[PDB]
Amino acid sequence: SLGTYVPGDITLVDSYGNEFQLKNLKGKPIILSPIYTHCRAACPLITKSLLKVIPKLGTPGKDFWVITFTFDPKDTLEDIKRFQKEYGIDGKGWKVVKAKTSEDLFKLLDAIDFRFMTAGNDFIHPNVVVVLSPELQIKDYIYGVNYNYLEFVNALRLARGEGHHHHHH
């Protein structure tokens, strides 16, 4: 939900096995990309679209964090490491992570209003990237699988508390 905060005490584990809490990433805007590693449909499209827009915007780990996270609670460290290598993701400025426990997973998905449902061996789910402020406030949602530059620039400005002086609020 726009304007609400993602809980900072969510524990994530990166594709190198490093554990951290979401609050550890405070200080820069955060681009969050929910996927599952065995998706051969939407998630590669989302991730490939991100690979094409992110370099226009800045340097992950410096200007903002990028966090690809799996919502499939059966994905293990091996799965997220495989996903990272597949897309050439650096793994540090742009991380591929999983939730430590189901509570971490619920809490994250609940905060960003994301729900999924089983469809045979796949999941049905929305295509979304969430942009957070440096304090973990949800500032924008970008939907679909074919991202444009301007929408991301605008989202990052909102994340930084910028691009508002054209209007009295």
Give the integer Cα–Cα distance in Å for 134 and 102. Answer: 25
Give the integer Cα–Cα distance in Å for 138 and 110. Answer: 12
CA dist 134 to 6, 65, 131, Å? 11, 10, 10
Task: Say if CB 56 and CB 13 are below 8 A apart.
Answer: no
Tokens 């999924």, residue located: 116
**Residue type at 65?**
W
Domain limits for position 155: 1-169
Rg, Å, the chain Cα set? 15
For residue 163, what is the domain's CATH number?
Answer: 3.40.30.10
Give the integer Cα–Cα distance in Å for 82 and 54. Answer: 21
Name the binding residues for Cu cation. 39, 43, 125
Name the binding residues. 39, 43, 125
Tokens 């051969």, residue located: 40
* Closest among 73, 126, 68 to 103, alpha carbons compared: 73
Experimental method of this PDB entry? X-ray
Q: How many domains does the chain contain in total?
A: 1
Residues paired with 66 in a beta bridge: 31, 94
**Helices 42-57 and 149-159 sit at what angle, rounded to 10 degrees?**
70
Give the integer Cα–Cα distance in Å for 28 and 5. Answer: 15
Tell me how crowded residue 169 is: count the other CB atoms within 10 A of its CB.
3
Give the integer Cα–Cα distance in Å for 30 and 61. Answer: 10
